[PDB]
Amino acid sequence: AHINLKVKGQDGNEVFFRIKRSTQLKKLMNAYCDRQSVDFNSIAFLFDGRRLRAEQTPDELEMEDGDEIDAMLHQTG
Amino acid sequence: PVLGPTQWLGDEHIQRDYELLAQELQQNNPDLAARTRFVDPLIAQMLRSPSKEVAERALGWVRPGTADFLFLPVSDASDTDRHQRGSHWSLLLVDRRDRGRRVAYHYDSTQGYNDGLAAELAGRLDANLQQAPIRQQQNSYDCGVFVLDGTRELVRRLAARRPDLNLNNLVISRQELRDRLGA
């Protein structure tokens, strides 16, 4: 019922999470930004080359234990 | 995403137009689409990450081995500083056709501005950096539009097998981009 995931930052920093596969990734994203003291709206999360949406769940994305999510700050120019 | 008339483009605007372009190319010229990569600007930055595993993950996502052409939007956003989110966009086209002489053409509407990042990305894609001509910007907010319209013009030229990829004659249209994003 549970899945362990790592969030990997652009500088290589890693944070580990354990969550239910039926739960929205919003909870992991909210917790990562909260813990990193960054605005949720300034961060994008990527998995398998695609931007993740907060409303998607791990089961929806076929995530398996040990999967990594890459967190990147948004860019402007 | 919403884009204003003089708003600086964010990665979300670039990525959305690249998504539309990829689907357009898949429908009109699937053989060129299969050999071309429109790299998400965030993934392009991952490719220059100081973290080797981040850069390698991004490389796998791009799968450059089976590609003849890579289009990379180049942001100058910081990898290590949360407040420096970028000032400028440029375009790197990697031509991998001669699998022994890979060339990375760097189109920058402010000539020279992003050359250091372009060189780092070209090296990480095993390619030699070549500055390539593009019409120079005459305002401080349209660099992202040059990147997107430059990409679209280059794709047309590649599909047509045109030899000259000089973009000094490029015509930009922010309005047409805003139309595409709003559709």
Numbering used by the authors:
A (entry chain D): 15 to 91
B (entry chain A): 829 to 1011
Paper text:
We have elucidated the molecular mechanism underlying this deconjugation activity by solving the crystal structures of NopD in complex with either Arabidopsis SUMO2 or ubiquitin at 1.5 or 1.9 Å resolution, respectively. The final electron density maps show the covalent bond formed between the SUMO or ubiquitin C-terminal glycine and the NopD active site Cys971, confirming the specificity of the catalytic reaction between NopD with SUMO2-PA or ubiquitin-PA substrates. Several conserved contacts are observed despite the low-identity of the C-terminal tails of AtSUMO2 (-MLHQTGG) and ubiquitin (-VLRLRGG). Gln89 in AtSUMO2 forms a hydrogen bond with Gln873, not present in the equivalent Leu73 in ubiquitin. In vitro assays with the NopD Q873N point mutant confirms the role of this hydrogen bond for AtSUMO2, and partially for ubiquitin or AtNedd8. A previous study reported that NopD was specific for plant SUMO isoforms, such as AtSUMO1 and AtSUMO2, GmSUMO (soy bean), PvSUMO (common bean), all containing a similar C-terminal sequence (-MLHQTGG), in contrast to the lack of activity for human SUMO isoforms, which contain different C-terminal sequences (-YQEQTGG in hSUMO1 or -FQQQTGG in hSUMO2/3). The structure of the AtSUMO2-NopD complex sheds light into the SUMO ortholog specificity in plants by the contacts established by Leu87 and His88 with NopD. In particular by the electrostatic interaction of AtSUMO2 His88 with NopD Asp839, which cannot be established by the equivalent Glu or Gln in the human counterparts, and by the hydrophobic interaction of AtSUMO2 Leu87 with the “Loop insert” pocket.
NopD, an effector protein from rhizobia involved in legume nodule symbiosis, exhibits deSUMOylation activity and, unexpectedly, also deubiquitination and deNeddylation activities. Structural predictions indicate that the 1017 residue full-length protein of the Bradyrhizobium NopD symbiotic effector consists of a long N-terminal extension, which based on the Alphafold-2 model is formed by a combination of disordered regions and small helical globular domains, followed by a globular C-terminal protease domain with homology with the CE clan of cysteine proteases. The active site catalytic triad seems already formed in the absence of SUMO or ubiquitin substrate, as inferred by the distances between the catalytic triad residues (Cys971, His916 and Asp936) between our complex structures with the AlphaFold-2 model, suggesting that NopD might be active in the absence of a UbL substrate, as initially observed in human SENP233, and does not require any substrate-induced activation mechanism. So, it seems that rhizobia NopD has evolved to gain deconjugation activities for SUMO, ubiquitin, and Nedd8, in a single catalytic domain by the acquisition of a “Loop insert” sequence and the maintenance of key “hot spots” in the interface that are essential for the proteolytic activity of each UbL.
